[PDB]
Structure 1
Amino acid sequence: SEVTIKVNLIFADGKIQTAEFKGTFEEATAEAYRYAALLAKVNGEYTADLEDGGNHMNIKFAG
């Protein structure tokens, strides 16, 4: 099936963005982590906390 992974992007200055990744569960997962690694190059190391069986992520950037 196609699922939607919802992500909170929480930046070190407290700003919050939200994003959605869609695909198979495994594709959307990989895309979310890929996007985190990309943003981390500018926003600092990320940590991904997974909720709802992996269908929601809280991704914090260290700054």
Structure 2
Amino acid sequence: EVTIKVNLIFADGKIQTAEFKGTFEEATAEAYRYAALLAKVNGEWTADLEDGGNHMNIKFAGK
């Protein structure tokens, strides 16, 4: 049981933050699925890990 803290960075620069809980694997997986959900409107994305992997930045290209 961990908590992955995510920065959802959109094309316009605005930022939303989220947290996913569970095993490091599932919580990370949830973050990626959430990104795909948001991609349908925010565009393609890239993700980068930090904080020993606990922190994550997801940047959407927009369009």
Deviation sequence 1:3-60 (CA, Å, 0-9, x none): 0000000000011000000001111010000001110111000100111222110000
Which SS does the other structure have where 2:7 is aligned?
strand
Alignment partners' CA distance in 1, 2:42 and 2:58? 11
Q: Percent identity?
A: 98
Alignment partners' CA distance in 2, 1:46 and 1:37? 8
Q: CA RMSD in A?
A: 0.6
TM-score w.r.t. length of structure 2: 0.94
Misfit runs of 4+, over 6 Å:
none
Q: Unmatched 5+ residue regions in structure 1?
A: none
Alignment partners' CA distance in 2, 1:47 and 1:18? 16
TM-score w.r.t. length of structure 1: 0.94
